[PDB]
Design a binder for these strands. Structure first.
Ligand SMILES: O=C(NCCCN1CCN(c2nccc3ccccc23)CC1)c1ccccc1
Ligand SMILES: *O[C@H]1C[C@H](n2cnc3c(N)ncnc32)O[C@@H]1COC(=O)O
Ligand SMILES: Nc1ncnc2c1ncn2[C@H]1C[C@H](O)[C@@H](COC(=O)O)O1
Ligand SMILES: [Mn+2]
Lengths: 672, 670
DNA sequence: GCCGTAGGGCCCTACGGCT
DNA sequence: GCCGTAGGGCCCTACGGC
């Protein structure tokens, strides 16, 4: 793995650390080989501030580095035996390289301090706008970043042992609470180097990145960027329900050239999760081929699979090209993307969310679309509606895997505060199997409980004689039968006691521990149910208001044009003779505007008209269209005038989603 | 790996063998778990007929299959110890599936023969046109392939143990000539019998590899996966003037439209085309880490970026002018080119290597200036000898430079299509001070890993097989270019060590020329005069069809323009006519009726916008027709005479030589 | 120790002809 | 034992809560 330099003279040799081999080859092809050694790593390195010494010292990349440096570590560390006098960090110019970078400083800091103290450690500054250094051309990497004559290494300064320790303790250490509070305080949601300055800046930039632009969903359409991009990716290449499937690999290439500069499996498996009906309560993707199973199996590889939108997914993208939502430059400015989807149903809650961020994490369960909506409706009529009153409509989450939820206290605590624990329970019955003996039949398991892994924890529990009663465990699941897991019982054993044991002892009963965080105005926030429904319904007010302002503007732009087309066709031949006497396109435009009182666009419209638009009935079609538009226009000014009318539309259109898409509660909420 | 079934009665238990987890996942889903086990393998299993008995038993997949059957092997076999009374071969429905099939049988037949005797070996029948079984939903894989009520299996039948021994030895044994002679022999361009499957299946594989994988086309020099690559770039306008599109987009364009195969096959093959130490006239221009002379792979395709070079435009030039026959891609959803115009002789310029089935090919690059001088000579002399030609084309011309030792292998190679040609690094001895010397190498042979080469040397010094060396450094720099230094012990002879380096290490290597290409969709060993004769014949046709095409299009455009011209003449009559027809269709009939126009001159008049009644625009129409009229009669000239035509191919060939023709890199020492 | 978006990469097979 | 298209798949790491 080590491409070493040739000179064995420490003082003038330096070593570069890079994220892996894609970067290695460009750095090996660009280095001055005499004095510069290259070490590739393997992406995210161990956080050593967190992991203990047996893990540390048995980690492949740390070993190589210690070896590489010849210094030993900790006590043993010694500065004379250093094989290089410049150890240079040179990670991707991206937030994930900024993190790797803090992961290395932490490591150097806890095991190789004297090294930062002799001023041996440096950070390299490659130019932004590449995905990794494996995207740079050889010379260019060398010239802007590795050539000792034009390059700009930041040398790492340690100024205060006290400050440094604390810094590290907070940012990299296991206590999430002080790392979280570091963020709230410093976050702004919109050449020698001080190691504390660097650690603080670099980890923040990564945290703020992970929080707003990765791991947590938006309140308004329920999605995290990758899902938004994918789903935006499909829409743009109209890979719609009524059209045939399309190749998983083209979709993912497209999405990764255009909206998502992250790896292909982070994206392809995002798309798969959206296709699985045991993951999404209302699947957003339609899946052709092997897309996984409840025994944890991965999808086929993405050359085999094909996909397109679910019908429900169109209701997220409806009204998108009517100015409803702001577009933003994508990562490289060659392309535009939606900052949010219209989302004509409350996605966040219906399909829920799970996500791990920094200094926090989120976990929102799925719900039943019929309930949500009826709930949104009640609140549309009563801004003061209480949480007791919402749970008349929304009984509680509703899993794609169904099963039971034991009681309303947890639901209640979690809808009131955004936090609470809900005990999920498999659907199990006890039934006879002939010969005077019984069995347990579970046919439904909790949400996010791997069945084969649960079926092994059970086998394990009987293998290790921690449970008396069980005579055989089989998995009789199939497409025909559905999920069917059978557990025989030994003759005469009570089977209720045995089932109950399994609930306490196995994932057969799991706790979903709700933590309803989502992105409210690009800043993360713990919300309870009413907050969530309010932001969403605030979002629909803007989606309809803006679609209607759009249509009105469009409608007026048209009627102006028909005002001009009417006049052509009412003066046709003197229009024709105006054009013919004139030589250039501009001089014609000059003459019509002035002659028949036109605007630029009208004259322009008149000049773009085909002769087939002069056939006889054409005049009338026009007049017929002008009048209906005037009507139309009037209506849309009604709807922007009266807030109640505006908010009455939203309902109507909401009432129509429910009608078309709403389905029966799957998960039962036993009480007691 | 094995997903077992619930029952322990082999009676009713059967086990389905698939390609992997892409395919196993869709099979695990669709199965009846009671009676139906699944062992997923991993791609091509070892060919036992060419393997050693130690290797075979160590082999992971082999072992899992043995355990699965639980019957032991050879003399320790036991038919009463069989865990499933039906073993089912359920591979992808593609040539490689077939291949894997044949391989699996070979294992069965050599070690578990009594399993085919006992009637325990079956072959499943998934539907065709899926890349894998993983492309299939579970339920649909169940209704077709796995459900006892609908599935149509084949019980593999052994009939004659001796034709089956001769047959396995022939197809899967390590003597090509028989296997080759089998393809030639058989090449055309329920219950089942084992021999009869083996021939038909191996033949489906071999034939696929030979015509649609491993062998270039004598016309454009391209394997299918390269051609598809260059068209993918064309059909996304990824041209050199435009910026650099991401490697993942292309690779994804190509896969789904064109090439139903692994994405690492594509990207690596597009990679090769960007590297200036591999291609003599690099076809792809890449932004980022594209590998090294030291064996370094390219960077992952999420990072790298690429477009056409300038010279690939020439391979593609006029592709869309019906210069070439399009054909239906794999799934019937797109059109892809059978071949590219190839406006310079790519096959020979960039050369080619591919390991086929029953045959291989290995052709070297050449210098484009000489190649084109060659073709010119041939155009004005059909009866030119390989030797005449050789006055133009000295010999090959590697992109890595170096020295060729002699002309005899070359001569041989162009007369017959086969020969050895000995390649040497360019190397020189020079002082370093103090009497002492070094050896400094600067170009190295084609296809030689500069790193592997150095290590080999370092192993030889350490093991003392080579004497008189005191150091060994690679001082290659992008700035100074390739530079390998070897420090001779004082007083030692440097020229002897050197000729010792050339005997023992890749410093000298041989290229074994073997010029097998596809001539009319059929694999053939050709020679220099045929490589160039089949190229010229392709130029004649490419250019003749374009100039035909270009004439059909002008004559159509002329026609329409004679329409617009009549409109402008009688414009107020036209107005009149159109205003007094209620509908378009009634205008259309009246306009044709009225002014003696064809159906198309009328639509185009109905289409004309008004802006085209302005003075400039009027003149614009008159310019187009006089110009095009004159163009037409030029096209008509060319087509009238084979010689004016041929001379055109020469003036176009000459232009390209002029523009991209470059200096010789490899020296031929007499 | 697993839920799910992120960074990062390596190894078995077939096939032919040269060494 | 390498060359070059093909079949096929696996492991490490961060991050937070339970
Ligand atoms: O970026 C894309 N593909 C990347 C190829 C991913 N390889 C897929 C298979 N890989 C591996 N699979 C199993 C085991 C592995 C073990 C070591 C290294 C790679 C492995 C390594 C990564 C892509 C493909 C098509 C369209 C868009 C992107
Ligand atoms: O690395 C092994 C393979 C190499 N080798 C080169 N050429 C041959 C041929 N023709 N046959 C066998 N091996 C060849 O030599 C090394 C040792 O050989 C084996 O054990 O295979
Ligand atoms: N809620 C929980 N908290 C901590 N460990 C849990 C856990 N659930 C399962 N485990 C397993 C994982 C490890 O095998 C081991 C201890 O944790 C550890 O050291 O990583 O126990
Ligand atoms: Mn429990």
């Amino acid at each position: 793995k080590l491409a070493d330099c040739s000179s064995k003279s420490p003082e003038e040799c330096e070593i570069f650390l890079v994220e892996g081999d894609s970067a290695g080859g460009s750095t090996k092809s660009g280095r001055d080989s005499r004095t510069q050694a290259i070490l590739p790593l393997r992406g995210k390195i161990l956080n050593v501030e967190k992991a203990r010494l047996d893990r540390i010292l048995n980690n492949n990349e740390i070993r190589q580095m210690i070896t590489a440096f010849g210094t030993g570590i900790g006590g043993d560390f010694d500065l004379a035996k250093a094989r290089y006098h410049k150890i240079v960090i040179m990670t991707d110019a991206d937030v994930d390289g900024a993190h790797i970078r803090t992961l290395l400083l932490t490591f150097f800091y806890r095991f190789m301090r004297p090294l930062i103290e002799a001023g041996y450690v440096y950070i390299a500054q490659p130019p932004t706008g590449y995905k990794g250094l494996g995207e740079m051309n050889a010379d260019q990497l060398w010239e802007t970043t590795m050539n000792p004559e034009h390059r700009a290494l930041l040398q790492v300064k340690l100024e205060d042992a006290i400050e440094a320790d604390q810094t590290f303790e907070m940012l990299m250490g296991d206590v999430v609470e002080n790392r979280r509070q570091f963020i709230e305080d410093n976050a702004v949601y919109a050449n020698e180097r001080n190691i504390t300055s660097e650690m603080r800046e670099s980890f923040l930039d990564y945290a703020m990145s992970v929080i707003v632009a990765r791991a947590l969903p938006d309140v308004r359409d329920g999605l995290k960027p990758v899902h938004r991009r994918i789903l935006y990716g499909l829409n743009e290449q109209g890979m719609t329900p009524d059209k045939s499937y399309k190749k998983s690999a083209r979709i993912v290439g497209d999405v990764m050239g255009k909206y998502h500069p992250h790896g292909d499996s982070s994206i392809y498996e995002a798309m798969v999760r959206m296709a699985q009906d045991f993951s999404y309560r209302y699947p957003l993707v339609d899946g052709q081929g092997n897309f996984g199973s409840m025994d944890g199996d991965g999808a086929a590889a993405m050359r085999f699979t094909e996909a397109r939108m679910t019908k429900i997914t169109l209701e997220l993208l409806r009204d998108i090209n009517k100015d409803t939502i702001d577009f933003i430059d994508n990562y490289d400015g060659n392309e535009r993307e939606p900052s949010v989807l219209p989302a004509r149903f409350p996605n966040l809650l219906a399909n829920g969310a799970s996500g791990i961020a920094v200094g926090m994490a989120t976990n929102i369960p799925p719900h039943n679309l019929t309930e949500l909506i009826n709930g949104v409706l009640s609140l549309s009529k009563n801004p003061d509606i209480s949480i007791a009153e919402l749970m008349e409509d929304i009984e509680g989450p509703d899993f794609p895997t169904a099963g039971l939820i034991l009681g309303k206290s947890g639901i209640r605590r979690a809808y009131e505060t955004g936090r609470g624990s809900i005990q999920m329970r498999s659907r199990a019955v006890i039934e006879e199997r002939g010969g005077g003996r019984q069995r347990i039949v579970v046919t439904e398991i909790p949400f996010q409980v791997n069945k084969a892994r649960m079926i092994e924890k059970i086998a394990e529990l009987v293998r290790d004689k921690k449970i008396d009663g069980i005579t055989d465990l089989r998995d009789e699941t199939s497409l025909r039968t559905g999920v069917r897991v059978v557990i025989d019982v030994r003759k005469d054993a009570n089977a209720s006691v045995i089932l109950n044991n399994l609930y306490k002892q196995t994932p057969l009963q799991t706790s979903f521990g709700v933590n309803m965080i989502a992105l409210v105005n690009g800043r993360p926030k713990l919300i309870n149910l009413k907050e969530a429904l309010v932001h969403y319904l605030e979002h629909q007010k803007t989606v309809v208001r803006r679609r209607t302002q759009y249509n009105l503007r469009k409608a007026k732009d048209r009627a102006h044009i028909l005002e001009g087309l009417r006049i052509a066709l009412d003066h046709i031949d003197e229009i024709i003779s105006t054009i013919r006497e004139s030589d250039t396109d501009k001089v014609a435009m000059e003459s019509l505007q002035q002659r028949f009182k036109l605007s630029e666009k009208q004259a322009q419209a008149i000049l773009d008209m085909r002769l087939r638009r002069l056939t006889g009935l054409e005049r009338d079609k026009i007049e017929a269209e002008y009048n209906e538009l005037l009507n139309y226009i009037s209506e849309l000014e009604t709807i922007l005038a009266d807030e109640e009318v505006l908010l009455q539309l939203v309902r109507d259109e909401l009432t129509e989603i429910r009608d078309r898409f709403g389905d029966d509660r799957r998960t039962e909420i036993q009480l007691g």
